[PDB]
């Protein structure tokens, strides 16, 4: 039939477009590991020339980075409900991940 | 007909495409596993951190908020509706407490 041809050509491209994206995240995952390995190796070398204190000057993985304007007021609320955190901003913000900051710093 | 073996050809290619995805699904699932094994060595966890200087170099200006939470922590951000508009972040952590560093 005919629409059995239109159905597989749309499904083809789909498969193709998905298999492609999968091969992209697959190398990204590889890049994530080498970046993590080098980051560890980098911190071990720095410790041999110096140990940094825990709550200060250090951020452990995983983490996120929230970026907003200097004029933006940030509020942190904890309620009666458990395992809940609520941050409020009076203006727009951006969220960045551990993976992206590792890429921005090289590895 | 031009269409009936446009079919047989297309229906001959998707299985190569099918198996390629099966392969790519197995490669991804034990690449992820190998990533999980590395980040929970106790020696590796000891040095899995970043400093202020690193954050500052990748984020020019402004106010920076660093939030650290255990794995599996869920982050929910609602739509900027109006009630003034609301920009918020809902954090749910079941495995522990969260640590927030104000970067300068």
């Amino acid at each position: 039939f005919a629409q059995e041809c239109q159905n597989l050509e749309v499904e083809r491209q789909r498969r193709l477009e998905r298999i492609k994206q999968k091969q992209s995240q697959l190398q990204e995952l590889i890049l994530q590991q080498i970046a993590f390995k080098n980051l560890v190796q980098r911190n071990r070398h720095a410790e041999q020339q110096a140990r940094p204190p825990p709550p200060n000057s250090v951020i452990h993985l995983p983490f996120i980075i929230v970026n907003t304007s200097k004029k933006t007021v940030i509020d942190c609320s904890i309620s009666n409900d458990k395992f809940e955190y609520l941050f409020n901003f009076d203006n727009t913000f951006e969220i960045h991940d551990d993976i992206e900051v590792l890429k921005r710093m090289g590895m | 007909k031009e269409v009936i073996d446009r079919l047989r050809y297309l229906k001959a290619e998707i299985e190569d495409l099918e198996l390629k995805e099966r392969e790519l699904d197995q490669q991804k699932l034990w690449l992820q596993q190998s990533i999980k094994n590395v980040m929970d060595d106790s020696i590796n966890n000891r040095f899995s951190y970043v400093t202020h200087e690193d954050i500052c170099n990748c984020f020019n200006g402004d106010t920076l908020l660093a939030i650290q939470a255990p794995s599996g922590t869920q982050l929910e951000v609602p739509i900027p509706e109006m009630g003034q508009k609301k920009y918020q972040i809902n954090l749910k952590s079941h495995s522990g407490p969260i640590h927030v560093l104000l970067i300068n």
Binding site: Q25 | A69, S71, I79
Partner: peptide, 29 residues
């Protein structure tokens, strides 16, 4: 009615969609 992100278990594509949503806000249809 909201976008979700998971610490050490969610693609960075998730945060990109979150950042775009916040920057754009409510859109005309």
């Amino acid at each position: 009615s909201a976008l979700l992100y998971k610490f050490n278990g969610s693609p960075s594509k998730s945060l990109k969609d979150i950042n775009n949503m916040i920057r754009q806000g409510e859109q005309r249809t």
